[PDB]
Each structure stands twice: as C-alpha cells, then as structure tokens.
Symmetry: D2
Subunit: 352 residues, 4 copies
C-alpha cells in the first residue's frame, strides 16, 4: 500500500505501508474521493501538534468498504460511505459526559492524520464501523459528499456553538471553506443578517451565495470599526471565528454585544496565548461567552448532514473550486492547499 | 369611534366606543392593515375564554402612530409600525422570570381581543409603545408585515420550542397559517426532513413551498401509521402541534422518538383534558418532553422577525390568499375565518 | 443457578437457570446486597410492560465481580462494584443522541427485570463492564451503596428534569424512596422552599430530613388547594411527580405557575391515558413544560452519585428501613414491597 | 444629607448634598445596614472604571423605605427591604434579550457607586422600586441580610454560569467572601468534591464551612499543579474564578478537562488583556467554554436568595468578620477594606 504522508515537521512525501487489518469492530475503506485541509498544513509546516513520522495525511474522504470485522453489522463490503474526520472510541468516559470529540484525551476524537494514518492511501482504517461510518446516498455527488466529513461539520458547529436566535444578526470572521459553511450554518440557525469578513473574491461570492448579507473586507479599515458601523454601534449578537490571527479573538469580543457569544471553530497553530480585551469583556462581567470546540464526528453527525444535503438544505459543491482526477494528484492538491492560490476554496481529488 | 367587536358569546358586530387616550407611556395607533385570526373565532363561537361584552376584536395589525404619551421616546405620530399581538406589561415578576407572555397572569401578555379592545377599530391603544412597537421598513409590504404580529411569531415559536437539531427530521401537525410558519421555522432551524400534515390543497401547496418535504393527509387514515411508515419505524425528532382536536397530543407523543420533543402552539378551545398515552410516553419515562406556550410579543421579537422578512429569510406573503379593501371588509374577512372555505389560509384587509 | 423470578403476570416464584456466561466485554457478578423495587410490582401484578416469561426480578445491587471477558480492562474478579439499574449497550444511535436510557429502543437501557434476567440470582450478568460498573469505595456501606443504582439516580433525575433555579420553590408529589431522593435532589439543585406531598409518617419524617420545609397530606383535602394556600396563589416553580394515580399529572399542572416545569420520574402502571388539564395548562400555551424520563445509568452516573455519598452531600441510608440477611429473604423483602406496610421506606437484603 | 464619597481617584471623604427625590416609580431609602466592597477600592485607588467626581460610594445595603413615587405599588414607608447592588431600568431591549445587568449599556444595570450615588449616605435613591426591591423577613438578621445584595448573588452566579452537574467536582479560585459564596453556590448546584483555592486562615475555615472539601494554599506549589495531583491527572469539571491576577484565567483553563467550563465573576481592575493558553484551550477546540458576567440584580434575584437564607440553605453571616455601630464608622469600614487585614472577610455597618 502506497500513500502520502508527513515525514517530519515540514517534510512531506509519498511512502509505503501495510494494508491495515480490520479489528472485529473496524472496517477497511478504499477512497472514492478525498480532499486536503489547512489543518494538515498547520501541523506539518508549523508543528501546531508536535512532530510525527511517516503519518499518511488526509481526514476528508468518502469511499467504499473493502472488508469488515466479524462484529460489524450495518456495513457490507462494497457499501458507499461518508467517513467523518472524527472517529472516536465510543466506549470511554468522555462519551458518557457528552464529548466524543475528546474521547480518550483532549482532541483524541480526531484520529486521522493526528494520531493515526490518514485517508491518503490506497486504503485506510476506520475504528468502530457501525458507529463511525454513514451510508452515502447515490443521489449525492462525490465532490459534494467529501465536503461533509470535515468542512460542513466544523462550520455548522460554529453556528451551533454561537447559540444563534431567530433573526439575530451574526458575524462570520473568515470565509474559507469552513467559514463559508459557518455562513450556511448561521442561515440554518435562522440568523437574520449575516456579516462575512474576508477578501478572496471567489469566497466573497460563496459567502453571498450561502447567505452572507454584508461583506466586510479587512483592508478598508479595522474590522471592529467597519462592523460597529454596519450595525450602528449595536454590534452583533454572535460572532463565529473561522480564520485569522490569534488577535481575531480580541476582534470578536469587541464586535459582539453584551450577552453575546463568541463561537470559535478555528484552529490556532502558533502563539503561546490568545488574548481577551479586558475592557470590552466588561472586565470579565460583560456576559460575552467564549466557545471553541473540535467539530462533531461519528455516524450520526454524518447521517444528519447527509440529510441536510439530500433534502437540499445546503449545497457544498460550491466549495469545490478544483477537481483532480487520479490518485497521483494528492501531492498537487496538498500543495495547492499550502500556498493558497487566489481562485481557490476547496480542491477534490476523485480516485474512482 | 367605530369598531368590530364581540357583543356576547356567539354574536358580533360594529359598535361605537370612545377613541382611547394614551398614558405617558402609551401610543394611539390607526390600522393600515389588519387580519382576522382563528383565535377570535374560538373566543366568540366557543366561549373558550369566558365571556366579553363589546370587546373590539382583532389583534393582528400594522399601523401608524397617531399620538404618544409624554414619555414615549422612539415613536412619533406618522411612524409606520408593526404591532405585536402580544403587548406585555414589561414591569412584572413574570418578566424577571423570562416569561413576558404571562406578565400579570397566565397568557396576560395577550391583551388585544382578550382583556383589551383589539385592532378592528378606527383607532386602538398600545401600552408601553417604546417596549411594544417596532418600526416597519418601507421595503416590506403591508400584507406581509401583518403576518409578523401573530402568524410568524407563533409558528416560529413552535419551532423554537422543538429544540430542533441540525438535520433532524420534524413533523408539523396542522398547516394552517400557523402550521405553515412552523414549517418555515422548522426550515429556519436547520431541519432536514419536514413531514407536514393537513388536507386543504392550498395549505399542502404552501407547505411544500415553505419547506415541507413530505405531505401526510389525516384523511387517508391514522397519522401515526403513515408517519411511522414514512420513517421506517424510526419516528420523528420533533413534532410541532399547530391544529387538530385534543387527541392530536397523543398522536404527537406516538410519532416522536424517545428523547424527542412535542412542541405545542395550538389553541385547544374545547374539551376538559388532553390525553397523553401511557405506553407510548414510556409510562412516563420515554424522555418525550411536552411543551406548550403562547407566542412571544414585544419590540425585540418583532424587530427580529422583521429582519427575517427584510433579509429574505422568509416571505410570509404566501400565506395571504384573500385581500380586501376598507374598514367595511373587516367583518367579511372575519366571517371568512368562521366558515373556513377550501381556498383560504389567511386573509388581510388593507385600510389605506 | 437459583433466583427469584416473574413466572408471568400476577405470578412470582423461585426458579432455576444457568450461571450466565460473559462475552468478551461483560462481567459476571455475585450479589452482596440487593433491594426490591415498586417497579417490579407493577410489571408483575399489573403487566404494565406486558407479559414476561420466567424472568428473574430485581435491578438494584452492589456485588463482587466473579469473572470478566478477555476485554474487560478496569475490573478484576473480586472487585466490589455498584451496579446501575440501567446498563445500556453504549454503541447505538440513541447514545449518539444523548439518551443512553433508550439505547436500542424505548426504555431499552433498562435490562434487569425488564428484558433480561435481574439481580435476584445466585449470579447475574452485566453487559459492558468498563462502561456499566463503578468501583465501590470501602467508606460506603452496602446498605447505603445499593440506594445508588436506582433510588438515588431516579429521585435526582426528577430534580434534574425540573430545571430548578437557585431559591426556587419546588413541589415533590409522592415521598416514597424515589420521592425522598427527589427532595434531596431539589435541595442539591439549590431549591429554597420544598413542599413534599405524602402521608406515611415514616416517609414524612424522611422528607423533612432530606429537605422538606412543608408537608402536604393528600388526606386533609385536595393537593392543589393546599399547595395554592402555602404559596399564596402563586403556585410552585416546579413539580416533580414521584408517585400517585394517573390523575397526578393534572395535580402537577395545576400547582405549577406559568413557565414552570412538571418533571415526572414516576412510572405509571395502569390506565390508557394520562390527563392534561386544558385550562390549567393554559389551553396549550401556559408554557408549563412536562417531562418524564427513565433514570440515568452507566458508569459515570454511578461514579457521580458515589462521590455525592462520599463527600457527604447526601446520605441514602435513611431510606433503608428494613435490612435482612440471606438469599431466601429476597422474597420476604419483595413481598414487603408488594403490600406496603405503614413503616416501610426501603428494604435491603444482605447476602454476604 | 451626608455621604461618604469618591472625590476623585485616590481621594475619599464626606460630602453634603440635597436629599434625593423619587420619580413616580422610584423610592427613597435610608440604610439600616451597609457594607464596603472591594470593588469600590478598585474604582477609587485604581480607577478600574475611569474617574468619577464626588460620587457617594457603597452599593451593598438593606434599609427602610422612607418614601415612594405615586406609582410605586408594592412598597411603603417603613418597609424594611434588601437592595440589590444592581438596579436596572427594566424598560430596555437588553432586558428583552434577557440581560438586565447590561440594561441600557454594558454593566449599566449596576448603578450605585458606578454611575449613581451609592448607599453610604443617610439616604439614597432606588429607581423602579416595584422591580428593584425585595421585602426583608423580620426573621433574617441585618448582618446576614446585607450580604445578599452583592456577595451572595455574585458568588452564586459564578456557580450558575459554571453549569455544574450533580456529583461534579468544582474548583473555586479565590475564596474571598465572593469565592466563599461561589463555594456554597457549587454546593447548592449539587457538586460533590469542591477544591477551594486560598491561604487566609479565616477564609479557609469559612470555605470548609460552606462546603469545601480540599484546600489549596498557593504556597505549596503552583495551583495548576496541586489540583492536577488532587484530581489524579483528571482535572476539574468546572472552574469558578472569584479572584487572582489576569493570569488566573490561564490556571483555570489549565485545570478544567475538555468540554468543561470556566466561570468568572471576578472584577479585574488592572491589565489590558486576559491570557488564554492556546494549548490547554486545545488550540481553541478543547470545548472549554469560558463565561464571565456581572451578578444578577432586581427584585426576583433578591427574593430567591432571601428564600434560600430564610429556609436555611446558606448562612452568609459567617462572611461578616467585622461589625461596626453608628453611621460614622462607615469610613473606617471602608479603609479596613483598602488595607486588607488578615482576619477580615467582610465588614458590616449597622446604623439602627
Ligand atoms: N482540527 C480540525 O480537525 C479542524 C477541522 C476543521 C477546521 N479547522 C480549523 O478551521 C480552519 C478553516 O479555515 P479554511 O482552511 O477554510 O481557510 P483559512 O485559510 O484557514 O481561512 C481563510 C479565511 O480567513 C480570512 N483571514 C486571513 N487572515 C485573516 C485575518 N488576519 N483577519 C481576519 N480574517 C483573516 C481569509 O481572508 P482571505 O479571503 O482574504 O484569504 C478567509 O476568509 C482550519 O484551517 C483550521 O484552523 C480545524
Ligand atoms: N391564542 C393566540 O393568541 C394565538 C395566536 C396565534 C396563533 N395561535 C395558534 O395558531 C393556530 C391558529 O389557527 P391556524 O391558522 O393554524 O389554522 P386552522 O384552520 O386553525 O388549523 C389548520 C390545520 O389543522 C389541520 N387539521 C384539522 N383537523 C385536523 C386533524 N383532525 N388532524 C390533523 N390536522 C388537522 C388542517 O388541515 P386541513 O387543511 O385539512 O384543514 C391544517 O393543517 C391555533 O392552533 C392557535 O392556537 C394562537
Ligand atoms: N423503571 C425504573 O427503573 C424506575 C426506577 C425508579 C423509580 N421508578 C418509579 O418511581 C416509583 C418508585 O417508588 P416510590 O419511592 O415512588 O414509592 P411508592 O410507594 O411507589 O410511592 C409512594 C408515594 O406516592 C404517594 N401516593 C400514592 N397515591 C398518591 C396520590 N393519589 N396522590 C399523591 N401521592 C400519592 C405515597 O403516599 P403514601 O405515603 O400514602 O404511600 C408516597 O408519597 C414507582 O412508581 C416506580 O414505577 C421506576
Ligand atoms: N462589581 C461588582 O458588582 C462585583 C460584585 C461581586 C464581586 N466582584 C469582584 O470579585 C471580588 C471578590 O471579592 P473580595 O473582594 O471580597 O475578595 P478579594 O480580596 O478580591 O479576593 C480574595 C481571594 O483571592 C485570593 N488571591 C489573592 N491574590 C491571589 C493570587 N495571586 N492568586 C490566587 N488567589 C489570590 C485570596 O487569597 P488569600 O486567602 O491568600 O487572601 C482570596 O482567596 C470583588 O471584590 C470584586 O473585585 C465585583
Ligand atoms: Zn481538517
Ligand atoms: Zn391570533
Ligand atoms: Zn426500580
Ligand atoms: Zn460589589
């Protein structure tokens, strides 16, 4: 078995490993369509999550089941499935507490290319098949399905953590594929006015498409300044962080009004700390809640977004700005993700 | 002043009353647009809410402020306003409890055509104008605006009470204009699949429009069986009740899965008790939460729903199937509500 | 293997079965201390859950692990453990929804004496040891610890479903063991005034001890009237149903104010429906929420209550009014639970 | 009329002014008991809230209503009442969003010794008596009562924001009187283990008195370290911040497990930004929600905490380490708070 992988911090390059074996509960999947993510770029070229050695990358993929363990009951070989970037061990205390995202340690729920071989290989392992895989409906295009395992789920969580109220006006700081899914999320939580913050033109279109009502380019003056202007000093009810500097937090705290919420689904790679503006936080008494969590995973989080897509509640295909054929183009795609061209949102490498 | 009032249970007509006078915190408004409600019919032809004598009916209207108390600070004569069906007294313990709908007593938030002359008059009084009036953007048409005060706020509340999760599948029992807004609200909360129940063609047609993905007619047999079959025995995540007799409650509990919620916004005008089936409620342990509350009123509520219409997140105008002109047509619209003709959803009477 | 079982509705006796065997993830436990429950009385002499054939009763026990599967990592034979009345299979869709109590179906998390042989056997089975067993601290006596599996977790769930707020006055309807634990629960959630309803002197004294501040006897007039008098027409903030007829639901809805909660933990064994007062439930808009749930189970649930007993926040021992020695007394005790003598709260049988 | 006031930053002293007059909805009150608050120290000798000119200090008091506006309905002269440190204008939109503390502006709900003349005067003004005053039962001692307005509501609020679950282990950072009430608060929320951080002997016994089970002296090592050891690498479920430097935020996050909550009620006076460890906050995906808000005020808040004290759910009197007689000592009492003696938790001044 061959596959892309992080050799060492900053060092990438294909390698060779064993076709993994399915435990009695696990399943082995063969990639049907995959995509790269800024998350890999961070942990690889910045050691946000320490160093690793020859660890196949990629967490986003849909594909078919090659073989299942004796105990697997809802998946046969040859079934098409959506594999969540999050595949936690479902029998730990974190789960009983209500946090599979951290089943077995902080962020432990996130296994692929973090603490396990990723989806960028002729085959990949999936722990607890019946709990971590989802049947992919034929009606849903491949390039669209691959947006669910990590873009949709992460973005939507953004909208979930924000406690959006019907008609509330929301601000989405950063409009990359995740930030964009947050704009869709907010629309879905019944947000009224959505203020998206970003410059890449193609993103600005997407944002408007997924629901953005007001675009705010962070090159026409400070962001806090421009928003307080649009909202007339009132501010925003909720603000979701989906990209930017560690100081983006300071910006969000200032634009949300008191009793508002700062929902963060962004992954901070560098910096030893994140700052909170003492004054705008009411010296700690302004009632502005700060949230930040790893996106939900598991079969359910996937069955549900499927429905969202199936019942045309959302169309993630608009995030796919580049479609590459055949395995080989993984490296191309990966790098294409490194130095983000200016016409890019999300690239998808079909395999079969 | 002339007004269409309830004369005595089972009798209605136009009467003569003094033009109301504003207290320092009130405002006197003239109707630009009003609409009749199933509610008034219940309190006039069912005596569901005790009796009344010469109580001007109606509680759905957009108007123009005519005069204001000495303490009103945000509304002047000439201001076009969206008037909430619920005009609570904002200085009570209920308010401090987070239940303004019950400020002063069970359902006391609802004053118009309850314990205070309604809007079906040349002029009508609004208490605490600054807290209970919202400025109506010119962009939004009268017939759409007159949907916010009651239809939209109620419908959406069923949605809110359902605690709908992203992608969940909800059932909306009863698709009158309220049921219709519940569907809309369901879609607004990220609902995936939406099973709408009702038979009137105009409703089934509007339901599909607002987001219903499945139609179930209670005339082809028991709702519970049809819904259980539509869901392959899985049942629905949430059920919003917006119609039917008392036995609709049982039906709700039976179609919702353990841990789901039955959200009620329907006005049960007849009967002594509502029945909850034991076995299907898990003999009291099915974790099937039952909710039932009055629609939210007040300024903020109205502003937010206005934003929904303004930012095209919803277009209530599709609920209007009959529009008449002039004061004399109030009585016609009203009767058009007593005897529900097949092509009706909601009628609006334009006054200028 | 010998064990006390339900032969069929209205029939209970001693039977014989094989010492069960443990799959790779289970453990076999021998009873150290067990107690009977009112829940079994219903299912048997009322067939409230339908027919049952030759099923060992009981589901409240603390015992010693006798053997474990090749996969049980946290429990060796000889380990003293508190076994939860609810032992769900932690790998299902319900668990991913936050309702392990209905893992695999409504009430399916409750296996012992429901759809699996109970704890009144020489030995009994426990599915998923690392997920369904909790180590018993030596500092906690058997007679007290066995109050944790069902009584403490149920009464507390009442308090949990009630959404109690600091200083709020709660009403507990029914002060049996569960009710008594609900009173403790209310107190543990910061309840101010607590009105307990019952009549058994032994129970009343017990309520005062766990936090009751007022005692209403349902043999001195209707509950509603008495409680409306103690609260001066204001009513209570929440009512936790913990016993009574089917009509108890209506009492609850009448005594709680608008926006309050009716939290049921009682398990109704008779009747087709449970009545809901149309008017006192504000015709469906009084915002009076109704909840009913099966007590939490699993390991974490037990560890948390263990802790409450350990750090002395609660002492269940007062529930135990009868203690007996000998495996043959499981019956004496069971029958004791059948025809409730005036001086009995809870009976416990010590086997070793 | 005399009053102890802040003449400017660093300059305190007595002043004379015109006895305030009530608007038709307000009430004038004379203090029966008052108490200095560390908060006032921060705003005087630190200007943590900019500067003020000749503003009577103090905001914690219980007095007797001397007179009321023609609209006040529930309060009369002679009526002994508790006065919440927070008295908002209940007719704002912040109120409609559910955040009275920020009615009309961030923290604008807190008027006394902030943007309004405080309670250290022979008389003071209380706006909107019917919404901002609660009767004081004869049975509650004055020194106990004067604790409710600020210490109790704030400490409890910390515990409320903490989202504490039954049997959870909570950590209280800073056992000042607030922290002391946070502890009782966590005890009231049904917490099991409670780790209290502090070193003042007198506060340590108060902490053990209100429910602490573990004491952590910031002398035997780093807070972060001792708590980890105490929780055997597991960490705490919730962290309630009631003291420390800006860095204390970092400690907190560091000790709460993923998916836990950091609740702050501590008023920071120095610093520009509060630090959040990028790593321990799981790079922002740890799900460690952070909350911080100005304590609740108003009548209900006071009524609820009053019932708590009355029903003996908390005895705040143990916070009162210093009692002073005569209106004149108010100044000494204040100073006693500037230079924190080692045997003081909370000083009180009884006038009559
Ligand atoms: N750990 C996980 O499992 C996981 C999963 C999902 C997501 N995530 C996190 O979520 C992020 C998703 O973002 P993405 O990859 O789609 O795109 P990205 O490149 O990470 O973010 C792009 C967005 O941020 C804006 N931006 C850049 N610098 C900014 C600044 N200083 N202030 C404000 N906005 C700024 C961009 O503007 P332009 O348009 O001008 O470029 C664009 O709108 C991930 O990279 C990762 O951090 C983590
Ligand atoms: N109290 C207030 O102030 C207030 C204010 C606003 C709203 N509301 C609430 O909103 C509603 C107002 O009425 P509305 O506009 O919703 O229209 P409606 O005409 O009252 O109800 C229509 C819906 O009920 C259906 N229906 C009738 N019988 C049924 C049955 N046996 N089983 C299932 N569905 C059945 C209708 O189907 P067909 O098409 O076949 O008839 C339609 O789906 C009330 O429930 C009221 O409580 C109350
Ligand atoms: N399925 C499960 O796993 C599970 C687990 C735990 C609990 N439960 C349920 O919870 C209950 C457990 O037993 P328990 O502690 O509640 O003791 P109980 O003996 O079942 O109930 C005793 C209480 O009900 C009162 N009562 C009886 N009729 C009443 C009426 N008409 N109005 C008001 N109160 C009335 C009793 O009054 P007296 O003082 O005169 O008796 C006492 O206050 C059962 O109903 C059981 O089904 C189920
Ligand atoms: N604005 C408002 O309405 C409002 C209301 C309520 C509370 N608050 C804020 O909360 C504060 C708490 O009340 P308080 O003033 O009575 O007490 P305090 O003096 O603010 O705090 C005392 C506590 O902090 C600990 N402490 C001091 N330095 C520390 C450090 N470096 N690291 C860790 N712990 C440290 C103390 O330890 P020792 O035992 O060693 O002294 C003690 O446990 C209020 O004064 C105010 O700032 C504001
Ligand atoms: Zn990723
Ligand atoms: Zn209506
Ligand atoms: Zn039981
Ligand atoms: Zn203070």
């Amino acid at each position: 078995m061959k596959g892309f992988a992080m050799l060492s911090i900053g060092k990438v390059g294909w390698i060779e490993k064993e076709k993994p074996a399915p435990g009695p509960f696990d399943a082995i999947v063969r990639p049907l369509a995959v995509a790269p993510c800024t998350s890999d770029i961070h942990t690889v070229f910045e050691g946000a999550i320490g160093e690793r050695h020859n660890m196949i990358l990629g967490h986003e993929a849909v594909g078919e089941v090659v073989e299942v363990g004796s105990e697997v009951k809802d998946f046969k070989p040859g079934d098409r499935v959506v594999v969540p970037a999050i595949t936690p061990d479902w029998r730990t205390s974190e789960v009983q507490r209500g946090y599979h995202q951290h089943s077995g340690g902080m962020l432990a729920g996130w296994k692929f290319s973090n603490v396990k071989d990723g989806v960028f290989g002729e085959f990949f392992h999936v722990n607890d098949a019946d709990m971590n895989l989802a049947h992919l409906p034929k009606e849903i295009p491949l390039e669209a399905a691959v947006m669910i395992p990590d873009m949709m789920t992460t973005g939507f969580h953004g909208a979930e953590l924000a406690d959006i109220e019907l008609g509330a006006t929301v601000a989405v700081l950063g409009i990359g594929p995740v930030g964009l899914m947050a704009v869709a999320g907010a629309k879905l939580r019944g947000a009224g006015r959505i203020i998206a913050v970003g410059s890449r033109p193609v993103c600005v279109d997407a944002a408007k498409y997924y629901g953005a009502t007001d675009i705010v380019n962070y090159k026409d003056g400070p962001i806090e300044s421009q928003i307080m202007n649009l909202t007339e000093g009132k501010g925003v009810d909720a603000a979701i962080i989906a990209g930017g500097n560690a100081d983006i937090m300071a910006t969000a705290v200032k634009i949300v009004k008191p009793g508002g919420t700062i929902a963060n689904v962004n992954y901070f790679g560098e910096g030893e700390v994140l700052d909170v503006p003492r004054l705008e936080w009411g010296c700690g008494m302004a009632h502005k809640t700060i949230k930040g969590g790893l996106c939900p995973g598991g079969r359910l989080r996937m069955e549900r977004l499927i429905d969202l897509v199936f019942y045309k509640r959302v169309d993630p295909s608009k995030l796919v700005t580049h479609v590459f054929r055949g395995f080989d183009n993984i490296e191309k795609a990966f790098m294409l993700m490194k130095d983000k061209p200016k016409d890019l949102i999300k690239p998808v490498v079909i395999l079969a």
